[PDB]
Amino acid sequence: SCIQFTRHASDVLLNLNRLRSRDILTDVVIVVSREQFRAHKTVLMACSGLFYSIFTDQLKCNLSVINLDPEINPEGFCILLDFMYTSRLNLREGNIMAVMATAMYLQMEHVVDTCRKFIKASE
Amino acid sequence: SCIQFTRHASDVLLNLNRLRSRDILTDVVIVVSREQFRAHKTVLMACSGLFYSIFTDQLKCNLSVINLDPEINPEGFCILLDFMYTSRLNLREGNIMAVMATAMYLQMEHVVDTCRKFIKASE
Amino acid sequence: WVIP
Amino acid sequence: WVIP
Ligand SMILES: N#Cc1cnn2c(Nc3ccc4c(c3)CC(=O)N4)cc(Cl)nc12
Numbered sequence: 001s002c003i004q005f006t007r008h009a010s011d012v013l014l015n016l017n018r019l020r021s022r023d024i025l026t027d028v029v030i031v032v033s034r035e036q037f038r039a040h041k042t043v044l045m046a047c048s049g050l051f052y053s054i055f056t057d058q059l060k061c062n063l064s065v066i067n068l069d070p071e072i073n074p075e076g077f078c079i080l081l082d083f084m085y086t087s088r089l090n091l092r093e094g095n096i097m098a099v100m101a102t103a104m105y106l107q108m109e110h111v112v113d114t115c116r117k118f119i120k121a122s123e
Numbered sequence: 124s125c126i127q128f129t130r131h132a133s134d135v136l137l138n139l140n141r142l143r144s145r146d147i148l149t150d151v152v153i154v155v156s157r158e159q160f161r162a163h164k165t166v167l168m169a170c171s172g173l174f175y176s177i178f179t180d181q182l183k184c185n186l187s188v189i190n191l192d193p194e195i196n197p198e199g200f201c202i203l204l205d206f207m208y209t210s211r212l213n214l215r216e217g218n219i220m221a222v223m224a225t226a227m228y229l230q231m232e233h234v235v236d237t238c239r240k241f242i243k244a245s246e
Numbered sequence: 247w248v249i250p
Numbered sequence: 251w252v253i254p
Pocket residue numbers: 045046047048049050052107108109110138139141142143145147
């Protein structure tokens with residue numbers, strides 16, 4: 001018999017992104033080659049099969065630094081991290097291959113799906 | 124020029140609620156009289172003006188335990204904490220006064236609004 | 247607010 | 251996916 005506030009989930013995500021921008025309560029640095037990205041472990045787990053696996057691990061859950069595979073593109077990661085916190089994906093011709101490869105590695109199935117559909121339309 | 128995934132914010136919130144149920148990465152206990160509630164500080168701040176103020180405070184941000192005013196009803200808090208993590212509000216005749224008082228204290232304006240409208244319809 |  |  002509950003009532004539901006339609007905009008609540010979007011409002012929560014907007015405030016989690018505000019916390020990220022101000023670097024409040026971030027508890028991990030994701031290292032992608034020469035670049036560093038601060039984030040909240042809980043948001044990363046909620047969006048990515050890879051981070052969900054990493055941060056449920058009894059040893060890795062306590063790490064303050066996570067280094068990604070050297071093949072991972074920093075811009076691709078940046079675009080996906082922005083997507084995690086906003087629901088918006090900056091998908092462009094010049095970045096689509098890097099975004100799709102990063103989304104496959106991060107296990108973000110909905111992003112992989114759309115990247116596949118956008119590439120198929122161009123061939 | 125971004126594209127947007129409509130269900131993303133709801134999917135994030137569902138996984139944050141799963142983390143809460145499994146007690147993963149919870150970093151605070153909220154004490155309401157004889158009852159204890161584990162939560163994520165980031166979610167509490169994102170939903171409540173009171174917790175936003177508390178956890179941006181340079182001293183209170185590091186506390187593992189927060190005690191609420193003894194006038195706060197544990198059931199009212201439980202209903203609001205469930206709302207924070209799900210967008211669903213279990214608003215009933217028997218709990219509406221406690222929910223509205225708790226929402227005013229927690230500074231959850233949208234919940235206060237609706238409680239006011241539901242009470243006005245019954246008078 | 248809606249009836250879900 | 252939509253055009254926001
Ligand atoms: N507790 C918990 C919890 C926190 N996060 N999380 C999940 N995170 C996840 C796992 C796999 C995938 C994605 C997100 C996006 C995607 O494409 N795959 C799943 C579950 Cl079943 N549970 C949880």
